[PDB]
Amino acid sequence: ATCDDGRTTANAACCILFPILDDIQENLFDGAQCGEEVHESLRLTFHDAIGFSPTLGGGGADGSIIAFDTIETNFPANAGIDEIVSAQKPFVAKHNISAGDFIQFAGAVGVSNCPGGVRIPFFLGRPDAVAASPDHLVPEPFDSVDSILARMGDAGFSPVEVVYLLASHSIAAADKVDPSIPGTPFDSTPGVFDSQFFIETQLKGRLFPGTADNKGEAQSPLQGEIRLQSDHLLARDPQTACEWQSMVNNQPKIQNRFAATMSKMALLGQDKTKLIDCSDVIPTPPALVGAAHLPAGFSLSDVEQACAATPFPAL
Numbered sequence: 001a002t003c004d005d006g007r008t009t010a011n012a013a014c015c016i017l018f019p020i021l022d023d024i025q026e027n028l029f030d031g032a033q034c035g036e037e038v039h040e041s042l043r044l045t046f047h048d049a050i051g052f053s054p055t056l057g058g059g060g061a062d063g064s065i066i067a068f069d070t071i072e073t074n075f076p077a078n079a080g081i082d083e084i085v086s087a088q089k090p091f092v093a094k095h096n097i098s099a100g101d102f103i104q105f106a107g108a109v110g111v112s113n114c115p116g117g118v119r120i121p122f123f124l125g126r127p128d129a130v131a132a133s134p135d136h137l138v139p140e141p142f143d144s145v146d147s148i149l150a151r152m153g154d155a156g157f158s159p160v161e162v163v164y165l166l167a168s169h170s171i172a173a174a175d176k177v178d179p180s181i182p183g184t185p186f187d188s189t190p191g192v193f194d195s196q197f198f199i200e201t202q203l204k205g206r207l208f209p210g211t212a213d214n215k216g217e218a219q220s221p222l223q224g225e226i227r228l229q230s231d232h233l234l235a236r237d238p239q240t241a242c243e244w245q246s247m248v249n250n251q252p253k254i255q256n257r258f259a260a261t262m263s264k265m266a267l268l269g270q271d272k273t274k275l276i277d278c279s280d281v282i283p284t285p286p287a288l289v290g291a292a293h294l295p296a297g298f299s300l301s302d303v304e305q306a307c308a309a310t311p312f313p314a315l
């Protein structure tokens with residue numbers, strides 16, 4: 001199909017996304033930058049989608065975190081999410097797509113701004129949300145590995161798929177974990193979708209980048225980085241450690257698995273056979289140019305190797 005402005009897309013129904021794409025690149029992502037707004041929007045895709053439990057309800061990736069923001073932003077695991085919900089809401093009001101479609105579309109567009117990034121498959125047509133997420137369905141950085149895996153598994157993700165989705169922490173920072181140092185990133189390259197997150201979480205903890213007493217926070221290996229206790233444990237737990245290490249210096253796997261697993265997450269509560277594929281509207285991401293590395297001055301002896309089957313790669 002050819003849209004009114006001449007841009008093309010496989011299905012014609014997708015044409016309505018082009019003006020929306022232009023508006024968000026300019027007015028949500030500050031000129032298509034891989035910065036805080038993109039990171040916030042990616043976090044939002046998960047906080048929307050994970051509100052899905054076979055036994056309790058919730059419609060998964062349904063826009064409920066916006067439609068029922070009064071409720072969902074009261075949940076403690078949603079701290080800080082009000083900021084991005086309030087930023088996205090006017091876009092949903094102005095354009096003619098559901099909040100559930102918008103949240104996933106904005107997340108996919110955002111990721112495409114980041115070097116190393118992928119185009120997450122995107123489907124159009126989610127109905128408006130009809131119920132708020134149940135309470136207590138979002139994992140916290142102070143939850144055990146068993147608790148996190150049980151929650152994610154309840155929503156349909158295997159332990160390896162949890163590791164794949166956590167590639168998101170390669171373009172990510174924390175504001176609430178330690179409020180004395182807001183915007184401290186989870187890896188040394190928060191504006192690059194790369195394997196540095198999987199590398200740097202494997203390093204021995206050395207210090208706290210801000211204050212020392214924060215719930216859900218582990219020692220960081222670097223002054224300019226923060227570490228979640230959940231990522232600390234996941235990198236080391238027999239259930240996840242080998243898959244974690246397998247992502248290191250393995251950008252093709254990070255790309256493939258993140259795109260596929262993000263699509264699955266984006267479709268929680270939905271049926272792709274009743275939606276329209278509009279994946280080709282997402283921009284083409286830049287590629288990486290620099291190689292994966294330990295931080296300068298660090299060596300293998302600084303790595304806490306946790307995979308009995310396979311030694312940590314020599315970087």
Ligand code: HEM
Nearest residue numbers: 039040042043046139140141165168172173174175176177
């Ligand atoms: C698996 C369990 C997870 C836990 C325990 C967890 C925990 C956290 C925490 C504590 C923060 C920082 C919030 C703050 O203090 O500002 C954060 C940020 C973030 N999360 Fe995760 N998360 C998990 C999974 C995911 C998944 C599956 C995604 C995929 C979209 C994701 C995407 C992000 C992003 C992109 C940020 C950075 C937000 C920003 O810089 O504004 N997280 N996460």
Ligand SMILES: [Ca+2]
Nearest residue numbers: 048051060064
């Ligand atoms: Ca939801």
Ligand SMILES: [Ca+2]
Nearest residue numbers: 170189192194
């Ligand atoms: Ca990174």
